[PDB]
Amino acid sequence: NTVSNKYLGETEIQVLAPGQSPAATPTKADKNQVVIDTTVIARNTVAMLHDV
Amino acid sequence: STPNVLTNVAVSHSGEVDSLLIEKFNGKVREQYLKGENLLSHFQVETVTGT
């Protein structure tokens, strides 16, 4: 009864000096969802005698 | 973990010169942009030699 989706974020850049391993930078993420719980109808009745 | 002793070649052992690099030249030389108006063409210009 639900449908979801995910979003990704940025990535940061930084300077490096020669001969070292720079630290990492995180990337955030999030989600969005939709629900379906209700239905609608329209109904009509016709009598046989009134139809003929 | 890290080397920390780099075999950098651009540094002089003696320390007299800052760098051993040669500073290549791209081959461009610039002057001003001034251009001749050529404005004397309109007028009559006679040459005076005797006087």
Whole-Å CA distances, B9 to A41, A47, B17, B20: 82, 101, 13, 8
Other Cβ atoms within 10 Å of A23 Cβ, number: 6
Q: What are the DSSP calls for A28-49, one per residue?
A: -EEEEEEE------------HH
Flag whether residue A19 sits within 8 Å of chain B, measured between CB atoms. Answer: yes
Tokens of B21: 């690099």
Beta bridge partners of A6: A31
B33 three-class SS: coil
A50 three-class SS: helix
Q: Which residues of B touch A19 (CB under 8 A)?
A: 2-4, 6
Other Cβ atoms within 10 Å of B36 Cβ, number: 5
Tokens of B43: 């007028």
A3 three-class SS: strand
**Residues of chain B contacting A, Cβ within 8 Å:** 2-4, 6
Closest CA to A35 of A13, A6, A9, A4: A4
Tokens of A33: 């969802």
Cα A27 to chain centroid distance, Å, stands at: 19
